[PDB]
């Protein structure tokens, strides 16, 4: 989770979409969804990313209806939005032991339980926190056999963003959960 504020500048892919969809939470508005291979995607939009800005007009207070609304009426060419980044996100390093464990459970994406005499233990991993990204990959969506795949197939040190699964709760709710699976960009970002 980098220290503070950037500024991204976007572009209208030729069907005039950008890849977000955006939710209203606690008067701020959060990416709720970046679609794979968008102009959201290019610019390094994430998953749980806040939007102070949009064209220097301030978010706070806005409806998730109404920043649908403001960014279908932007002139394309350029769109700069004001990011803080991933906010009620935290950034966990484990290391595996010899069996190839990190040392939790989880369920449906949520950490449920923490394995004693573990790197997940010494690191303070918390249990009712939802994987949100996995050696800077987005886990959103994927099966939890993926999820396990993912962590099998990462080297030694593991980095996990997780976030309090009553937010993550919040911020998914009305988005369909094969879109979820489908449509959330899981790639490794391009250079």
Known sequence: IKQGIREVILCKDQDGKIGL?????????????????????LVGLRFGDQ???INGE?????????????????????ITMTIRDRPFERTITMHKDSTGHVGFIFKNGKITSIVKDSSAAR???????????????N????????????????????????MP???????????????????????????
């Open 21 to 41: 969809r955006l939710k209203s939470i606690d008067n701020g508005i959060f990416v709720q969804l970046v679609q794979a291979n968008s102009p959201a995607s």
């Open 139 to 162: 886990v959103i969506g994927l099966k939890d056999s993926q999820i396990a795949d993912i962590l099998s197939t990462s080297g030694t040190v593991v980095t996990i963003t997780i």
């Open 123 to 137: 690191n303070g991993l918390l249990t009712e926190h939802n994987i949100c990204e996995i050696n800077g990959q």
């Open 165 to 191: 699964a009553f937010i993550f709760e919040h911020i998914i709710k009305r988005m369909a959960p094969s879109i979820m699976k489908s449509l959330m960009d899981h790639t490794i970002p391009e250079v």
């Open 58 to 78: 301030n978010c706070a207070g806005w409806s998730s209806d109404k920043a649908h609304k403001v960014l279908k009426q932007a002139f394309g060419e350029k």
């Open 51 to 53: 939007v102070l800005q």
